[PDB]
């Protein structure tokens, strides 16, 4: 923890309202638990309308503001983009595309230190959520559940004894998978309930429906 190497402040996220990034919302609630965050929602002029729940996903904004105080600025822009995108004040950093990459960045702000093996495992799970689970066949999804269930019989969270960005992204992607029935194995069921018991997880999930 520290956060002032090259001090950046305002994080901008462009997201398509037809595809709300649930992992980023969960992450946003989590950051708020550790940092003083100033949160704003805009609608880019390339988007005609936006559902009310999405317009006010940062609604618990009625609170008195430190104003002077803010550590991080988090601006969500509903925009007609093909892929969720994060931008910074800095010209040197390219726009970051993909919620998995944005999630990795945001979770890293918590300072969690990992060794080579475990950091790479965490990254692996995020890739699986994005490249296999997000848009895979019924068979590809069944194979993900099997891997998760095996891992979750060995540790309480996907990468070990602590919540990591792996749990955030995979749980989120699972909630937005909607079309065809598949059945969840028992270690995955236990882990889902472990996730849902956390305030940031369930409040962000409620936001997604009216």
């Amino acid at each position: 923890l520290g956060k002032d190497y090259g001090a950046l402040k305002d994080i901008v996220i462009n997201a398509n309202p037809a595809s709300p990034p649930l992992s980023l919302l969960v992450l946003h609630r989590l950051l708020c638990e550790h940092f003083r965050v100033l949160s704003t929602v805009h609608t880019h002029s390339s988007v005609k309308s936006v559902p009310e729940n999405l317009l006010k996903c940062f609604g618990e904004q009625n609170k008195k503001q430190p104003r002077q105080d803010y550590q991080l600025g988090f601006t969500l822009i509903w925009k007609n983009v093909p892929k969720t995108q994060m931008k910074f004040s800095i010209q040197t950093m390219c726009p970051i595309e993909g919620e998995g990459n944005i999630a990795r960045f945001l979770f890293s702000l918590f300072g969690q230190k990992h060794n080579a093996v475990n950091a790479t495992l965490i990254d692996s799970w995020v890739d699986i959520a994005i490249f296999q689970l997000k848009e895979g066949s019924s068979k590809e999804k069944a194979a993900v559940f099997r891997s998760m269930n095996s891992a979750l019989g060995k540790s309480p969270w996907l990468a070990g004894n602590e919540l990591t960005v792996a749990d955030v992204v995979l749980w989120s992607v699972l909630q937005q998978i909607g079309g065809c029935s598949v059945t969840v194995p028992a270690n995955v069921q236990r882990w889902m309930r472990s996730c849902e018991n956390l305030a940031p997880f369930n409040t962000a999930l409620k936001l997604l429906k009216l």
Partner: protein, 168 residues
């Protein structure tokens, strides 16, 4: 030590470039095989190419392949996904290659002014993309991408991996 098995019939040039740019820092052998497996230890293997690249970049703290800070790290993550998704589809390739060209217009390497996993990943994926080859031979490749791709290809590490492993 570290052992990488590769699919000899379809080698992961990116991972092999990483092994090449890393060999002076960590002991690692390459085995012929029919799939990509990085054996780290008894209970630890990585089988997907981006995970293999990440792990190698992380244990080789001399090579600097995962950048020098959180922002460069995040840019490298961006490029790893770019090559695995957009650049692997050969679908809306023209738009994807034009995005890559735009990004390289003011850069020499993709991230932080030195060689990183971003370069290895995107280069390897580009070499294996038929639409890229069909652009080069037909003199339609975008200027900056051609410039950066030729630069890497003329490096001795790239020429060495190409000669040994590249199945024309």
């Amino acid at each position: 030590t570290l052992s990488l098995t590769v699919n000899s019939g379809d080698p992961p040039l990116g991972a092999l470039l990483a092994v090449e740019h890393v060999k002076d820092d960590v002991s690692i052998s390459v085995e012929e095989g029919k799939e990509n497996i990085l054996h780290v230890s008894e209970n630890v293997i990585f089988t997907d190419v981006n995970s293999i690249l990440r792990y190698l970049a992380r244990v080789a703290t001399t090579a600097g392949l995962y950048g020098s800070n959180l922002m460069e790290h995040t840019e490298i993550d961006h490029w790893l996904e770019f090559s695995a998704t957009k650049l692997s589809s050969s679908d809306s390739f023209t738009s994807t290659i034009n995005e890559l060209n735009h990004s390289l217009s003011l850069r020499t390497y993709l991230v932080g002014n030195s060689l990183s996993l971003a370069d290895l990943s995107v280069w390897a994926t580009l070499k294996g993309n038929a639409a890229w080859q069909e652009q080069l031979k037909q003199k339609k490749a975008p200027v900056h991408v051609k410039r950066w791709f030729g630069f890497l290809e003329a490096q001795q590490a790239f020429q060495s991996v190409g000669t040994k492993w590249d199945v024309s």
